Ligand binder design. Structure first.
Ligand code: NA
Ligand code: NA
Ligand SMILES: [Zn+2]
Ligand SMILES: [Zn+2]
Lengths: 281, 5, 281, 281, 281, 281, 281, 5, 5, 5, 5, 5
C-alpha cells in the first residue's frame, strides 16, 4: 500500500501529548506542532512512537488558529522528523492520510481524500477524531500538508498556515489577529425590502445591499465606537462592501490599534464612526 | 455573512 | 363533612360527556354546561350518575372562553339539576369543591379553596384534572360557582361568565369577541431608554411609556392596517395608554367591525391608522 | 385542629418499617399492618414513634392486594394501638388523614378527603407518598379506614378488606385469588360491526356484545384450555356476559381448581372449553 | 490522484440549487438533474462552479424516484456538461466519487466504492450528505453513474434510471407508477402454522406460503376493492405468488387503470376481487 | 371560611419583591421579611397589595437560613403589618395558610396543614411555589408562624427562627454559622464490620459505631487540620459520638474561630487534631 | 478496481447466518467462521450468495474471543471457499475490504485500511456494521485476514487467532481462558503519593508503582482468595509488576486450576495469598 | 373492559 | 403586557 | 416482504 | 448521617 | 491498566 510507505516516512515523528491529543516533531531540535486545544493552557508530556517519554513545554499558542508549538530536549537517539510539504498546491481529490498516536507506541492511521479547499481550511473524508487530533495529515508521498483538528467530514489546518506563525509561537506566543467585534450578515435589496415587508421583522433595513450588523459583541471596539445591532456599514474607507467575508480581510490588512472609519446608516440617519482594531482573544 | 470576531 | 352535603346536592347533576370530560345539568330541560375543549367540535353521549345514558347534541361553543352548552332530552325520571350560585361575591379563601364524573356512576370529588381571583378567572388548590374538567366547582353550600378547566393550582371559568353567554350558546353559537391581532407589551421610559442603551436590542423604542407592539399576528385587522412589530400605539381615540390589559378592553367595548383609529409612532415618524375589529376565531 | 386530635389518637401506633415504608400496630400483641410492597419478600426492623426499635418478622403477604402482616414482640411499655374503623360506610367527601412515620420519631401528616369510592379501592386528594405508604388513612375521628399505597390523587386499600385476610396473613400467608389469565375487553355490536368495517382491524369480531379476549397470558389456565386472542366468550355457565368486570367476579365465586366451561365463538365456529381456575401469583 | 482527473472532468458541471442541494447539467441546453426532494415543489436559483448564477425552473418531478429535471437558459460561456455513463455494468467494489456544490464555487468531493447493487439502487461507502445530494456519483473515469441521495452507507439513484424518465420530466412531469395500496409480507407455512400456534397472534393465517396483506392503505384501489388486513392473495392472474417483491412487478407491467383480479382467501372463505391500478402519489 | 378572616388579617401586609418572590411587612417602620434567595445579592422594588410601589433596600441576608430583611420608607397611608405568632407551640395537623403576592394587587392563597415538625423546619401540604415564596405561612388565626420557601410537600422557615436573627440582618448582615467542612455519616459496627466484609468497599472502617467522614470539603478547617475521607472521629472533647446530627450542634455551641480537638482513628492509627471553626459562607 | 477482484475471489464464500449476521466458509467440508455474538447460543440457517439455503449447526463458540464455528453439509454444487491469509504480517495502512452478506444473494462491500494493529485486534476505517459482522476482512489480494466484529473505526478479530482455536470449536467448544477476577490499574508513585495527598481519595496507596486492585469481581478466584479492593499486588512469583496488561499474560501462561501466589500489601500489612485460576465464562 | 389476571 | 388576540 | 405503495 | 457544612 | 476478567 502506498500509504504504508507514507506512514513509514512521517509516522515515527508523530507523538502523544498529554487533555490528550497528538502532535508531530518539526525538526531535530525538538520542535513539535499540535492543536492549541490539545494544550489546555498548561505547559505536558510527549511520548514518541518508540516509547521514549520526553518532557515538553508549550512555547506558544494561537487560540484562533487552534495550533501550538511544544518543545522537547533532544537526547540519545535522533528525534524523528516529519517532512513538511506545502498546502498551496493541494488538489481536491488528492489522497489524505491522517496519522495519530493515541497511546504512544503505534500510530493509528486513516485514509481519505481532500474533500474541499478553502488555503483557509482543509476538509477530508479521512476519519478524523480525538485519536489523531494535532497529528499530521499527509499526502500520498508522506509529507505533512495539514494538522488534523477534531471537533463524515473532518478538518485540518493547512501546513503553510502553521509555517507562518511557527517562529512566533516558538518565541513569544502572540499572533496578530485584529478585529472589531461585529457579527455581520450579507444583506440584499431583495432580502432587505423583502424584510421591510414582513410586519414582524425586528428592524427595517434601509434598502440597499450590504453588511447588516447582526450583533455587537460585548466589550469590543465596535461596542466602544457606538455601533448598534441593525446598523448597516456601507463603506469603510470609501470602499463599498456587501460581503461579510471581505470586511474580515481589510481589518486584518490594517494593523493592531488601527483606526478605521465606518460609513454606516442607522435606519434613516447617516452615521460615521471610527473603530480601533483590537486583538481577538 | 459570517461575522465572527 | 360539609362537603358531603355539597356533593349530595349538586353531585347527581354532574355527568360524563364522551375527547372525554365532565359536564353538569343546568335545568330539567336537559341543558348541560361543559368545557368547549371537552367537545372536539362534534355534536356526544351523556351519562348521568345513575347510569342513564342519554344522547346529547352540542348547541353552542365559545372557544375563547372554553365553554359549551350540550342538550339532552328529558325522559323518564327527572333530570337532576345543579343549583347555580354567583361568582361575583367570591372571597379568596372560601372552600372550593371540584366535582367530576369520570366514569358515569360515582362522582370524583376534590377539596380546596379559592386560591386567587381575577371575575376573570378562578384559581384553586383543589386538585383539578381531566377527571373533573367541565364539571362544576362548588362553594361550601353546594351551589356551582365555576367550571373546572384542566390544562398545584387549577383554574375555573366563573359561573357568572357562563350565565352571560348561556342563551347564545343555547341558540346560535357565536359570541362577540372583537379583536385586532397585536401581541403588545407594557413599555416604560426606564425600560425604553434602557433598551435604547443596549447595543443589541432589536429596535430603539421612542422613549415614552406605552404599549410596544411585540408581534403582528398573520391575517389580522392589525396586519391589514399596516401595523408593524416595534410600533408604539400612544393614543387610540385621544386616550393615552401604557397598559396592554387596558387596550384589550376598549376594543371589546367597541363593536364588531368597528373602526378604531390608532395614533402610533414608528421610531421617529408619527403614524395614525384605523384598524377594524374582527371576531377572534 | 380536629386532625391534631386524630393524629394524637392513632399516630403513636404508626411505625417505620425498614425497601422502606410505614406500617401501623393492630393490637398489643405486636401485629402490624403494612403494604406488601413495603416488604421486599424478606422477613425487617420496626421503629415506633417513641424511638423503640423492635425487630419484626413478616408473617404473611398478599401480593395482589398489596398488604402484609408484620409481627413484633411486646416488651416494656405497652405497644400503642391504632383503632380500626370500618370502610363500608365511607362517604365521598369525608375527611381523610394520611399518617406516615418516615424516620421513626415524628409522624408526617397530610390532609384531604375521600376523593372517590370503588369498597374496592379508596381515592383521596390527601398527599400520599413513599413517606406514608403502609401507614393508615384515618377519618375525622382518628380511626383507620384505609392503608395508604404509594405508586394529585392517592390510593388506599380499604380497612374492611385487610380485616378479612388478617388472620390468614397472620398465619399461613396464602389468600385465595382464583383466576384464568385472560385480558378481556367489553365489546359492543356498534363497536364490533364498526370494527368489522375498518379494513385494518386485526380480526373481525363476530358482531354481538361481549367480552373480547384481548390477550392470553403465558402459562395460564386460559392458555392451557386453548383460548386464543380474538375469541369471544359468550356464556360461562349459561350466563350471558358483556362485562369484563363481571367475569372477574364469577371466577372468584368459584373455588380454586374449579372447572368452568366457556361458551365462546372463534370468528364463525362455536367453541366450548373448560378452564380450571388457578391461583394468581 | 485518479479522482482529481474525474473531478476535473465532471466537477465544473455540478451546480448549487437553492431547501438546498446540488444538481448537475446534462447538456448545453441547460438541462439539469437533481433530487426531487431538493426541489420543495416550487420552480429555484442555480449557481455554477464558476460563480454564474442562472435562474432555473423545475420542468418535472418524480416523487417516488426522488429526482427532478431543472432548466436554465444558456447564455455567455458554454454551460459545462457532465458526461453520462451507464449503471447497467457497475461492479460491486468499483470506485465511487460523490461530488456536490454546497456553496456554488468549489466542489466538495468524497471517495468510496460501490457498496452494493440492487439497477434498483446503489449503495456506497462514499460519504453522502446534504452537501452533495442531487449531485452526481462518478466512476473512476469521471462519468456519472448515479445521483447522490441523502436521507456509514449512502444511496444513489442509478443513472440509467434517470435516463428513462428524462424526456418525460423534461416535458410533462408525470411518470407511470401503478399501484394498489397493500403493505404485504412474505408468509411461510412454517411461519403460518407457527403463527397459528401462538395464542396471541392477531389472526390465524390459512396455512400456505404467500403474501400476507399486513395493511390496507387509506383511499387506495385495495381499500376500494374490499381488501382487508390479514387477507392472503394466493394467485393474481393464475400465477401463484409468495413474494411481496414479485407482486410489485406485475402491477407495474399492467398499465394504469388496469383491472387485476385477485384470488385470495379470508381465513376460510375463498375470495376473488379485482383492484384497478391507480397512480402512486 | 376561617381562612378568609386570616387572609384579611395578614394578607394586606404581604408584598411583592422584584429574581421575583414575596415578602411581608414586620412593622410600620418598613421592615420586611423574605427569603434570601428572593434577593439575588442586590439591594429591589416592593409592591403592596394596594398597589403602592415603594423602593426597598436589602439590609441583611442569611444564606444558610435563606432569609433576608428588606427595608422600605413609610410614607402616606400606614404600612399594613402582619402579626407575628410563635412556632414553638406548633402542632402537627394544625391548619397552615400560605399567602403570596405574585403580582402586587391580590394575594394568592393556599390551604394545608402542618405536615411535619423538625423548630428546625416546617413541612406543609399547603401548595408552596414561586408564587408565595418569602410570603408568610399563617395559622388558623392569621398570625405568621413561618416563611414559605420554594425549592406535594412544601417547606417553611419557622418564625421564631427569623425573630432571632432579625435585628442582626436589620443591622450588619452576618449571622454566626460556625462549621468545619466535613460531610459525615452515622456508622454502625453492624454496618462497619459488615462493610469490612465486602471485598469492594473503599476503605475498611475500624469496627465501632461512629461518624464516618465521608468527604472533606475543599478549603475548610477540616482540610486544613489534615482530616481525610474515611477517618472516624470517635470523641471531640471526651464526648463519644456516633451521630452526624449531634456533632453539628457542639460546633455551633463553640464560638467562631474556636479550636476543637478531634480524637479520630485512621484505619489503625489513633489520631488527634484540632480544627478551628470557620464561618459557613 | 482491485477490490472487485478480491470480492470476486472470497465473496462467493461469504454467507448469511440467521440474531442475524454474516459468516464465511473455511473449506469444502462446510466449516464456516462467524462471530459468537451472531449465534445467540442456539444451533441456524445458512444462505450462500447463490441462494442455496443449507442448514447449519453451531459446533463451537468462544465468547471471550467472540467467534463461532458453524457446520453445513456439502451437497450438490461445490461449497465456495474463502482462502485464509495470515494476520501476522499485516502492515498499518494496508487495504482492508469488509465483505458481508446481509440478505443472502449479493455481498455488501466496504473499503478501508488497517487503521491500527494490536495480533491482538485489528482496527479499520472500512465501514463495519451489522451488515457484515462475522464476514471476512480481506487484503488487496482477497484472502481473509480478519473477522469483522460490529459493536468511524471498526474492529476485526485477526485470522491467525481463529486458526488457533478452529479445531477446538470444530470439536468440543471450550477454549482455555484462565483468569482470577481482578479489575486492576497501573499505579505510579507520582500517582500514588499524589493520591495520598488528596484528602478525598478512597484509600491511601502504599506509595510504590504497581497494579492497584480497583475491583474484585463477584464469585471469582480473587474473591475466594480474600483479595480486596485497594490491594496492591507487588510480585506474583518473585516477578515485580506495575503493568495491568502484563499480569493478564502470566495468568494465561499458567494452566487452568493453577495456583499462583500473590505478594501484595494491604495499606501497611504485607500479605501473600494464592489464587487458583478459573475459566472465564 | 379490564381483564387483569 | 399580555397582547393575546 | 416489503409492500410499499 | 447528614454532614452538610 | 485494564483488568478485565
Ligand atoms: Na478510501
Ligand atoms: Na384541605
Ligand atoms: Zn391539597
Ligand atoms: Zn471512508
Amino acid at each position: 500500500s502506498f500509504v504504508a510507505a507514507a506512514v513509514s516516512r512521517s509516522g515515527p515523528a508523530v507523538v502523544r501529548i498529554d487533555g490528550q491529543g497528538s502532535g508531530f516533531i518539526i525538526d531535530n531540535s525538538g520542535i513539535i506542532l499540535t492543536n492549541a486545544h490539545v494544550v489546555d493552557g498548561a505547559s505536558v508530556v510527549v511520548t514518541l512512537r518508540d516509547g521514549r517519554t520526553f518532557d515538553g513545554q508549550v512555547r506558544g499558542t494561537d487560540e484562533v488558529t487552534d495550533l501550538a508549538v511544544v518543545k522537547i530536549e533532544p537526547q540519545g537517539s535522533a528525534l524523528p522528523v516529519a517532512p513538511l510539504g506545502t498546502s498551496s498546491n493541494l488538489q481536491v481529490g488528492d489522497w489524505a492520510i491522517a496519522v495519530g498516536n493515541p497511546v504512544g507506541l503505534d500510530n493509528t492511521v486513516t485514509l481519505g481524500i481532500i474533500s474541499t479547499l478553502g488555503v483557509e481550511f482543509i476538509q477530508t473524508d479521512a476519519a478524523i477524531n480525538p485519536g489523531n487530533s494535532g497529528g499530521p495529515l499527509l499526502n500520498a508521498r508522506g509529507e505533512v500538508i495539514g494538522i488534523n483538528t477534531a471537533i463524515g467530514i473532518g478538518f485540518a489546518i493547512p501546513i503553510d498556515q502553521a509555517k507562518a506563525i511557527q517562529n512566533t509561537l516558538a518565541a513569544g506566543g502572540t499572533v496578530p489577529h485584529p478585529y472589531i467585534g461585529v457579527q455581520m450578515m450579507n444583506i440584499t435589496v431583495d432580502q432587505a425590502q423583502q424584510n421591510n415587508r414582513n410586519p414582524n421583522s425586528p428592524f427595517i433595513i434601509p434598502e440597499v445591499d450590504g453588511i447588516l450588523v447582526m450583533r455587537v459583541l460585548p466589550g469590543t471596539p465596535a461596542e466602544r465606537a457606538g455601533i448598534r445591532r441593525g446598523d448597516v456599514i456601507v463603506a469603510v474607507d470609501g470602499t463599498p462592501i456587501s460581503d461579510g467575508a471581505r470586511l474580515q480581510r481589510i481589518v486584518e490588512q490594517a494593523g493592531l490599534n488601527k483606526a478605521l472609519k465606518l460609513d454606516l446608516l442607522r435606519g434613516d440617519r447617516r452615521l460615521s464612526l471610527t473603530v480601533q482594531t483590537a486583538q481577538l482573544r | 455573512x459570517x461575522x465572527x470576531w
